[PDB]
C-alpha cells in the first residue's frame, strides 16, 4: 500500500470545474456586497445587515 504525489494530484475534471465554480461564486458574492454598500439586502431574521452579508457570503 503506498501514497504518492500522483494520489493527491488534481485530475483534469476538477481543474476545469474549480475554475467555473470559483468564478461563479466570486461574482455572486460581489453582487451581495453591492447591495449592502448601496441598497437593500434582505436582513435575515434577528441580524444586522453586515451580519447578513457575512452569512450569505459564507
Amino acid at each position: 500500500f503506498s501514497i504518492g504525489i500522483g494520489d493527491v494530484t488534481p485530475g483534469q475534471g476538477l481543474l476545469k470545474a474549480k475554475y467555473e465554480l470559483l468564478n461563479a461564486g466570486y461574482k455572486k458574492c460581489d453582487e451581495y456586497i453591492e447591495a449592502l454598500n448601496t441598497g437593500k439586502l434582505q436582513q435575515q431574521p434577528g441580524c444586522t445587515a453586515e451580519e447578513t452579508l457575512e452569512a450569505l457570503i459564507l
Binding site: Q44, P45, G46, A55, L56, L58
Partner: protein, 107 residues
C-alpha cells in the same frame, strides 16, 4: 442644557425669584428672568425591533446537503468542522441531520 454666565463663565442654575424663575450664577449677581417658554428636547431612541427568529431557512443557510451521517443517512443536513485543538492531529467535525427531524449531533 448647559448655559453659562456672561460675566464669570460659571454654570447657571435654575431657581425661583419674586416675579419669575431665574437662571442664576452661584458666584456673581447675574440673573436672567425667564419671561417666555423655553424648552430642550432630548429625543431618545425607540425600541423598534420586533425580531421573530429561528426559522428553518435561518438554520439551513449553511453549505451542506445530501451527504451521509453515520446514524440516519438523511440528505437534509447541517454540518460543522473544527480544527482548533492541535492535540487532535486528526480533524474534527460535527453534524446535524434533520430530514426526518431525527436530530443527531455526533463527532
Amino acid at each position: 442644557m448647559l448655559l453659562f454666565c456672561p460675566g464669570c463663565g460659571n454654570g447657571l442654575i435654575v431657581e425661583e425669584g419674586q416675579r419669575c424663575h431665574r437662571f442664576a450664577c452661584n458666584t456673581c449677581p447675574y440673573v436672567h428672568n425667564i419671561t417666555r417658554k423655553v424648552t430642550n428636547r432630548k429625543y431618545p431612541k425607540l425600541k423598534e425591533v420586533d425580531d421573530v427568529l429561528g426559522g428553518a431557512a435561518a438554520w439551513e443557510n449553511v453549505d451542506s446537503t445530501a451527504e451521509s451521517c453515520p446514524k440516519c443517512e438523511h440528505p437534509r443536513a447541517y454540518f460543522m468542522q473544527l480544527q482548533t485543538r492541535s492535540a487532535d492531529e486528526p480533524m474534527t467535525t460535527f453534524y446535524k441531520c434533520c430530514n426526518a427531524q431525527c436530530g443527531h449531533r455526533w463527532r
